[PDB]
Amino acid sequence: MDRRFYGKIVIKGKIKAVTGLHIGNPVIKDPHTGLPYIPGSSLKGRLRSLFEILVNSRLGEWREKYPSLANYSPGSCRPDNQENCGKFFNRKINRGWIHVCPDYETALACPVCRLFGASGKESNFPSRIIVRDAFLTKEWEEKWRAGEAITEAKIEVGIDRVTSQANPRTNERVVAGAEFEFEIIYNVENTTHWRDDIKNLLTAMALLEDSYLGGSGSRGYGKVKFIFDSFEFRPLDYYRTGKDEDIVSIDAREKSVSDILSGFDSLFSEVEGKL
């Protein structure tokens, strides 16, 4: 009931992978232009699984602020077999357990399934962020015409603990510094609580730059670091005039912890003026 539209907050920028990365030992690449890419599902799922962990283990500081977390408790339905109990991760996919609210208007109050979307039997809360596949930047198109190593074949040995025997194999991983170009669109469906979702998404980006992205990562395959070009707002009036009548946040140097830093309410104040 009552889906609305106010605008589309657009987050562009780049992803400077500081350490060599491996989504995938073939990295999955674009079949038309050869080059690798970061998929959009691969970023959205890693932001969601690094944010359900933030929510699940801290159910004190959120449940007064987000109702309908009173149906949960820190845990998982992995030991027993119920799809709906007090344990948090309630949906079994087919062999793994992931939090999805099974109702529309519980997901309308949940702090996970109100931003990343949710499934349901005839309930189905659709998402509010869309995450697009990050290809390279044009300053790696121009580094690919020079015939340079867009990837590298690393050889990571497996040492036997008894016979002291080696067992090497080759991983194939994207080169360090390979800077992919992302695109995240928040879809403003309610003017009351978009502060919560945008601060929530920047929390997920901080917990992503803390963590890794793709591959093992424990051995070094992640180290993802966002570099923002332009938050924008694009109100409804943009899609009817087509002018430059869209609110632009300027943070061309700032950091994902610095944008969520004291001054979120200082930078987004024009969006607050436009709602």
Partner 1 sequence: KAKYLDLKNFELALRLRPFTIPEEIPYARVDVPRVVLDRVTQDSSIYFWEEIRFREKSGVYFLYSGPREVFDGYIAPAMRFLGDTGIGGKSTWGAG
Partner 2 sequence: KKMLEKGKQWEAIQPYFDNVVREAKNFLEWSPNKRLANAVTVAAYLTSQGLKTNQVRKILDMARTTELKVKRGEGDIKDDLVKMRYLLAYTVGKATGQSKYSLDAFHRILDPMLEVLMGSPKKENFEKFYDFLQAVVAYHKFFGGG
Contacts with partner 1, residue ranges (CB under 8 A): 1-3, 8, 10, 28, 30-33, 39-41, 44-45, 49, 52-53, 56, 76, 78, 89, 93-99, 104, 117, 123-127, 129-133, 183, 185, 187, 234, 238-240, 242
Contact, 69 vs 110, CB < 8 A? yes
Which residue, 203 or 258, has its beta carbon nearer to RNA? 203
Among RNA, a second copy, partner 2, none, the one that 274 touches (CB under a kind-dependent 5 to 8 A) is none
* Distance of alpha carbon 272 from alpha carbon 250, whole angstroms: 15
CA distances from 230 to 7, 165, 267 (A): 16, 52, 12
Among partner 2, Zn ion, RNA, none, the one that 110 touches (CB under a kind-dependent 5 to 8 A) is Zn ion
- The site string for partner 2 over 200-239 (x = CB under 8 A, - otherwise) reads ----------------------------------------
Q: Give the one residue of 139, 148, 210, 237 binding partner 2; rule: CB under 8 A.
A: 148
Classify the phi-psi angles of 47: left when phi > 0, otherwise alpha if psi is within -120 to 50, otherwise beta.
alpha
Phi/psi of residue 189, nearest 5 degrees = -105, -5
- The site string for RNA over 76-105 (x = CB under 7 A, - otherwise) reads ---------------x-xxx--x-x-----
6 in contact with a second copy (CB under 8 A): yes
Interface of this chain with Zn ion, residues 69 to 128, rule: CB under 5 A: 101, 110, 112-113
Among partner 2, RNA, partner 1, none, the one that 97 touches (CB under a kind-dependent 5 to 8 A) is partner 1
Q: Which of 132, 94, 109, 113 is nearest to 48 (CA)?
A: 113
Q: What are the beta bridge partners of residue 86?
A: none
Residue-wise over 216-246: b if at least 16 C-beta within 10 A, else e? Answer: ebeebbbbbbbbbeebbbbbeebeeeeeeeb
- The site string for partner 2 over 23-42 (x = CB under 8 A, - otherwise) reads -----------x--------
How many helical (H) and strand (E) elements, i.e. helices and strands, does the chain have? 9, 13
Interface of this chain with a second copy, residues 132 to 161, rule: CB under 8 A: 132-133, 135, 148-149, 152, 154-156, 158-161
Q: Is 85 annotated as a binding residue?
A: no
Q: Which of 13, 14, 51, 18 is nearest to 224 (CA)?
A: 18
Which residue, 217 or 220, has its beta carbon nearer to partner 1? 217
Helix, coil or strand: residue 229: strand
Q: CB of residue 34 vs partner 2: minimum separation in angstroms? A: 4
Amino acid (one-letter) located at 65: K
Helix or strand (DSSP H, E) at 19: none
Q: What residues form the annotated binding site?
A: 99, 101, 110, 113
- Residue numbers in the known binding site for Zn(2+) are 99, 101, 110, 113
Binding site for partner 2 (CB under 8 A): 34, 148, 153
